[PDB]
């Protein structure tokens, strides 16, 4: 793969990167950069936490938004030179951004890609949209939930609807936190050295969503139907019960981590209600879920149930949970970038040299 396009999706927690045309990211590494805590000069990814002990670790991406441009540069460098092993200047590069990304950010990013990395061509696409594309639709409402943030994004004919976007500062990073908390409140000594890592694995291995939380609690109270076990490496085995479904419940009841916000079913419903009454039909029947925090077993049907209850009785609801939705966004991009009707949509270095960083903002 040379003279081919690159796809780079920068999550709050995870970076996904690869080549357009590929069915999956060749590179998935933690979105973190570490510099020597005292006085080589920088580390990124797995190696940065491997040596967390002698570095100050930082996260360029907070809430899905880029906040540290220097550190973000180191991430992109590590992406091209160290992960993909490619030269940016001979690959058009597609990049992804959060809904509601400020214009100054998009331009700052376009500006770096050109001046600093000297890529021949580039494009910025909104993450949620790519997810939708990945499913083969151009109309619907996406629920993207990654490590740092959660959005509801209504989309109509390839264009998102900014007035109707719902943002929720609750994602997997805080769900892992919640689980770590509870687990400990039951005598399980957990810290960050290496525990934080285990708590996350338990999360993705054992947690699931209850179709009926009140009802599911009573089950785990009257039998051991729902107990499951996890042997730590130390050796100490531990058992989990209602904790398996109480942790993800936080997505529907944020008041579990004490957030007086509303749950993803409500924000999904509110988001649709915020749209043209004539396209609601299309939206209700096209809930596409993306992100790693949507991977919980049972979340699709819980959502289906919750929404059927909020909406009109006559409307047909539908939830689409691609088994690949952990990587939907990236896949969405992988597809786009490879299509031929898209090849005219690239921003060329030439175009940028004439107009300026502002040559990356279109309406319609």
């Amino acid at each position: 793969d040379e003279t081919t396009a690159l796809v780079c999706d920068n999550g709050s927690g995870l970076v996904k990167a690869g080549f357009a045309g590929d069915d999956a990211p060749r590179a998935v590494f933690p979105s973190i950069v570490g510099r020597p805590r005292h006085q080589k000069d920088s580390y990124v990814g797995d190696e940065a936490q491997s040596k967390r002990g002698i570095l100050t670790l930082k996260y360029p991406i907070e809430h899905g938004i880029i906040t540290n441009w220097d550190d973000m540069e180191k991430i992109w460098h590590h992406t091209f030179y160290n992960e993909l092993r490619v030269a940016p200047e001979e690959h058009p590069t597609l990049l992804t951004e959060a809904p509601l990304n400020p214009k100054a950010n998009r331009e700052k990013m376009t500006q770096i890609m050109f001046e600093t990395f000297n890529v021949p061509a580039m494009y910025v696409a909104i993450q949620a949209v790519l997810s939708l594309y990945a499913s083969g639709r151009t109309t619907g409402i996406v629920l993207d939930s990654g490590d740092g943030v959660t959005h509801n994004v209504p989309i109509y004919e390839g264009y998102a609807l900014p007035h109707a976007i719902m943002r929720l500062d609750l994602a997997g990073r805080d769900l892992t936190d919640y689980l770590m908390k509870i687990l400990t409140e039951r005598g399980y000594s957990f810290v960050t050295t290496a525990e934080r890592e285990i708590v996350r694995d338990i999360k993705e291995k054992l947690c699931y969503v209850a179709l009926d939380f009140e009802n599911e609690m009573a089950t785990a109270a009257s039998s051991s139907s729902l107990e499951k076990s996890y042997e730590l490496p130390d050796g100490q085995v531990i058992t989990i019960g209602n904790e398996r479904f109480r942790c993800p419940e936080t997505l529907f009841q944020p008041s579990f981590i004490g957030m007086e916000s509303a749950g993803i079913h409500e924000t999904t419903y509110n988001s649709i209600m915020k749209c043209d009454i004539d396209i609601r039909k299309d939206l209700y029947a096209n809930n596409v879920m993306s992100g790693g925090t949507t991977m919980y077993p049972g979340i699709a049907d819980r959502m289906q149930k919750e929404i059927t209850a909020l909406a009109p009785s006559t409307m047909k609801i539908k939830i689409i949970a691609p088994p690949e939705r952990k990587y939907s966004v990236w896949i969405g991009g992988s597809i786009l970038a490879s299509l031929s009707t898209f090849q005219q949509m690239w921003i060329t270095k030439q175009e940028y040299d004439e107009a300026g960083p502002s040559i990356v903002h279109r309406k319609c």
């Binding site: 083969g136 898209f342 279109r362």
Partner: peptide, 22 residues
């Protein structure tokens, strides 16, 4: 894009596509 070019991109997307397997 904003022209008689956005509709074909759209149509192409829905069409689908294969992706080199790794």
């Amino acid at each position: 894009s904003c022209n008689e070019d956005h509709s074909k991109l759209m149509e192409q997307i829905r069409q689908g596509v294969k992706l080199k397997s790794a």
